[PDB]
Amino acid sequence: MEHVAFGSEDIENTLAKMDDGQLDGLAFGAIQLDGDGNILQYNAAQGDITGRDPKQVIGKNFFKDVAPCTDSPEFYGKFKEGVASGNLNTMFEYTFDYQMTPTKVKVHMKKALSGDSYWVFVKRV
């Protein structure tokens, strides 16, 4: 298992160094998005939470297609504010309930180290 803790101050530095295989060793869910919300990476721990097969969601749009419950000012609105301002770093609780048993999570969104892609980190609560 990779040793990186959810919510770490320098998490984006650690994950910039990791390939796909290593992302799958994280203890929490990790999704990498572009600025339009298209899914670039989606790890195994996230699929364990949500029942989605990573291979099938990569390339889809997270807010339009995969996770409509996150199309809300509270989630998608904060994402788009952070993409526009260049300072995305926020943590909040949320419920995921589209085609799945409703599941409470903690979400951390953070800009990636290079600044042109964005992470969504998820763990159960």
- Quote the tokens at residue 34: 């572009």
- Should residue 11 be labelled a site residue for ligand HC4 when binding is judged by CB under 6 A? no
> According to the binding rule CB under 6 A, does residue 96 interact with ligand HC4?
yes
Q: Measured from the CB of residue 120, what is the shortest distance to ligand HC4 in angstroms?
A: 8
> Which of 70, 111, 117, 121 lies at the binding interface for ligand HC4 (CB under 6 A)?
70
Least Å from the CB of residue 62 to ligand HC4: 7
CA atoms of 58 and 74, how far apart (whole Å): 23
**E strands, the chain, where?**
29-33, 39-42, 89-96, 103-111, 118-124
Neighbours of 31 (CB within 10 A): 26
Residues in touch with ligand HC4 (CB under 6 A)? 46, 50, 52, 66-70, 96, 98
